[PDB]
Amino acid sequence: ASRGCADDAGWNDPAMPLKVYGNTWYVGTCGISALLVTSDAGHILVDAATPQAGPQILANIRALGFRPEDVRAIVFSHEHFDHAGSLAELQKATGAPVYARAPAIDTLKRGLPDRTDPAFEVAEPVAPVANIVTLADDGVVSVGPLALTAVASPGHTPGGTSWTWRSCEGDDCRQMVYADSLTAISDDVFRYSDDAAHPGYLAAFRNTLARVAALDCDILVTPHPSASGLWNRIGPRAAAPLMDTTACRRYAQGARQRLEKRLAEEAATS
């Protein structure tokens, strides 16, 4: 029997791919999520993991019997190297456009962020993405019968987005939420409390927390699977229900607590 994935798994440690629910499949690594949402008209790939992950994601898509060439749209959570790292590689393999909100586009074209990213100084360089479609902050990405709805989630980064859609097993349909990271982490310079350096940024983070908390959610997944306890819910170590309609609310509430802890840490230092 396979032993499954650890909660502190390396970002590049391989995961056997497996159904989340209905036509939503997990194709990421043990430490970093990626999802494939499938239809007989084509597929949507959600996230690209770490600049090293192109081949594992492609192998996992094929392991499930899907063709990368049948992917018609790529979306992602946020423009850090551990989630956007293999976007260019995946666009070449699929021929699919990458959808991105305005505040992520320059980062995707450069392959590095600028100082608007809290984690600017610890960024690793990425391959630029050649074909980007600018996504409105409440935009819908449609491929055949598939429809993924964007929820703009700035805070962890300027360009972060959460995604939501419905997947069905027969007549039993679930609202899936791939909620962006909500951790208030940074490099050694950035201060969330320095509004003059980034006006409105922290207010936008608080707004993101409230919006995520309010989403209709049946099944939550997060870019770092441990942030939503994914490996306690699917795979060999599963011991808790996959569906939990309180998950988004608890996720955002915990994130708010941690954000306020970060603000207390900033108040304590010069």
Out of Zn ion, Ca ion, none, what residue 222 binds, judged by CB under 5 to 8 A for its kind, is Ca ion
Considering beta carbons, is residue 43 or 80 the nearer one to Zn ion? Answer: 80
H helical segments located in the chain: 54-63, 81-84, 87-94, 102-110, 201-214, 247-267
User: Is 51 one of the annotated binding-site residues?
Assistant: yes
Residue 251, C-beta contacts closer than 8 angstroms, at least 6 positions apart: 179, 182, 212, 213, 220, 222, 227, 228
Sign for the CA dihedral angle at 90, 91, 96, 101 comes to positive
Considering beta carbons, is residue 82 or 89 the nearer one to Ca ion? Answer: 82
Out of Ca ion, Zn ion, none, what residue 117 binds, judged by CB under 5 to 8 A for its kind, is none
Considering beta carbons, is residue 17 or 28 the nearer one to Zn ion? Answer: 28
The phi-psi region of residue 47 (left if phi > 0; otherwise alpha if psi is between -120 and 50; otherwise beta) is: left
- Residue from 57, 222, 252, 259 binding Ca ion (CB under 5 A): 222
Residue by residue, DSSP assigns 169-213 as ETTEEEEEEEPPP------SS--TT-GGGSTTHHHHHHHHHHHHH
User: Is 82 one of the annotated binding-site residues?
Assistant: yes
User: Is 218 one of the annotated binding-site residues?
Assistant: yes
Q: What mask of x and - would describe binding to Ca ion in positions 164 to 203, judged by CB under 5 A?
A: -----------------x----------------------
Distance separating alpha carbons of residues 253 and 2, to the nearest angstrom: 34
Out of Ca ion, Zn ion, none, what residue 227 binds, judged by CB under 5 to 8 A for its kind, is Ca ion
Q: Tell me if 37 sits within 8 A of 50, measured CB to CB.
A: no
Question: Shortest Cβ distance from residue 62 to Ca ion (Å)?
Answer: 26
Question: Shortest Cβ distance from residue 222 to Zn ion (Å)?
Answer: 9
Considering beta carbons, is residue 39 or 201 the nearer one to Zn ion? Answer: 201
User: Is 198 one of the annotated binding-site residues?
Assistant: no
Distances (CA, A) of 40 to 142, 144, 145, 218: 13, 8, 9, 24
Considering beta carbons, is residue 116 or 226 the nearer one to Ca ion? Answer: 226
Out of Ca ion, Zn ion, none, what residue 47 binds, judged by CB under 5 to 8 A for its kind, is none
Distance separating alpha carbons of residues 146 and 15, to the nearest angstrom: 25
Binding part of the chain for Ca ion, among 8-16, 53-61, 222-230, 248-256 by CB under 5 A, reads 222-230
Residue 227 interacts with Ca ion (CB under 5 A)?
yes
